Structures are given as structure tokens and as C-alpha cells.
């Protein structure tokens, strides 16, 4: 039930999303070990993910959360990197996409820094890198991230030493 719509690089929506990718790169304290060494991306394609069932499942929960949080869904746009991107866009997020060993418990994790999510495209801590070259810093192979609509509602603030 999922359709993917290519956006044109001449489209304002493409440029907007690219700018969100590019402007939220940072350096990482691992020196690039997990996600590679880079300051910017080459954006190759941006697709809108269209799935009526998954969207209505999302907006149904969004309204519940809003009503429990003084009418504020606290909706953000956040990055998610995962080896399971193809399953996520067809079936949605579920517990099998959860970070079992994540610092805040077994949940689904998102980042404001695109480069944080880039650390997980090939696995936890970058895994063994790209499947072709086994290179966590591969400049050749194409990577995929998700830029996701996320309902936070009332968010528990946890000051981590990261």
C-alpha cells in the first residue's frame, strides 16, 4: 500500500528537506568511526512516502496524544537511520524497529542531527559499514535515511551526558 513519489530538485519541498539534512550535520565524538568522516552530503533523491493506512494510524494517535497534552501534539520532523528502512516505509514503525539497548529504554529513536541518524544506516555503531566495501566511511555507496513526522506529546526531559 505504500507509494513513493520522487520530488524534483527544482521543487521547494526538495530543497527544504535537503537543507534540513545538510544544516544538521555535526562532528561526532567518535571521530567518524560509526557514520564516517564528512561535513556534508550529496543528496541523490528525495521521495515522499504515501500510505493511507499508515497515515491515518499516525493521525489517530496524534489526536489522542494532543488531547492528553493540553491540545498539543508536540509534533516534530526528525531523522531516523536504520537497516530496516524498506520494512518501515511499507509496514510502519513497530517494536522490531526499536533500539533494544538504547540509553532511554527499548523504544524507537529519532535525531535532530541527520549525522546522528547516519550512524545507524548500516547497523548499530555503523555495523561493519556498507555491504559492498565493508566501509563505515564509504563515499561510494548510496545510503538512505528517513525524515519522519513524530508525535512527542508530553516529553520526559532526560539530561544525558552525551
Amino acid at each position: 500500500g505504500t507509494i513513493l513519489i520522487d520530488l524534483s530538485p527544482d521543487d521547494k519541498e526538495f530543497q527544504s528537506v535537503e537543507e534540513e539534512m545538510q544544516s544538521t550535520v555535526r562532528e561526532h565524538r567518535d571521530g567518524g568511526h560509526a557514520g564516517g568522516i564528512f561535513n556534508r552530503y550529496n543528496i541523490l533523491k528525495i521521495q515522499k512516502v504515501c500510505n493511507k493506512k499508515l497515515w491515518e494510524r499516525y493521525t489517530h494517535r496524534r489526536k489522542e496524544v494532543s488531547e492528553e497534552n493540553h491540545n498539543h501534539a508536540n509534533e516534530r520532523m526528525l531523522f531516523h537511520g536504520s537497516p530496516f528502512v524498506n520494512a518501515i516505509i511499507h509496514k510502519g514503525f513497530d517494536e522490531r524497529h526499536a533500539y533494544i539497548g538504547g540509553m532511554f529504554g527499548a523504544g524507537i529513536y529519532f535525531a535532530e542531527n541527520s549525522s546522528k541518524s547516519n550512524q545507524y544506516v548500516y547497523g548499530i555503531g555503523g555495523g561493519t559499514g556498507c555491504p559492498v566495501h565493508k566501509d563505515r566511511s564509504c563515499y561510494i555507496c548510496h545510503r538512505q535515511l528517513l525524515f519522519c513526522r513524530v508525535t512527542l506529546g508530553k516529553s520526559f526531559l532526560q539530561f544525558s551526558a552525551m
Binding site: 528537506v17 539534512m21 555535526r26 565524538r29 564516517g36 564528512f38 561535513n39 556534508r40 552530503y41 550529496n42 543528496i43 541523490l44 533523491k45 528525495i46 521521495q47 512516502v49 499508515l54 497515515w55 494510524r57 499516525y58 494517535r61 520532523m77 526528525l78 531516523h80 528502512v85 516505509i89 510502519g92 514503525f93 513497530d94 533500539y99 532511554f104 529504554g105 523504544g107 524507537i108 529513536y109 529519532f110 535525531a111 535532530e112 542531527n113 546522528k116 547516519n118 564509504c138 563515499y139 561510494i140 548510496h142 545510503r143 538512505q144 535515511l145 528517513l146 525524515f147 519522519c148 513526522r149 513524530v150 508525535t151 512527542l152 506529546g153 539530561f159 544525558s160 551526558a161 552525551m162
Partner: peptide, 30 residues
Amino acid sequence: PSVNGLALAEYVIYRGEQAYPEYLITYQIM
């Protein structure tokens, strides 16, 4: 993050229904 001043926030949800994968971005690091 309370130590790295340049690190932005990370977020966790516990129900898959609280996120929708709106955009799929294909890219290379440079």
C-alpha cells in the same frame, strides 16, 4: 545532551503509531 553544546536532541517514542516515515532520502556522505 548536557556535555556537547553542539549536539542536538535525540527523542524516543514507545508506540510505532507515533511516527510516520514521511520522506525517504537517498544520499552519499562527501
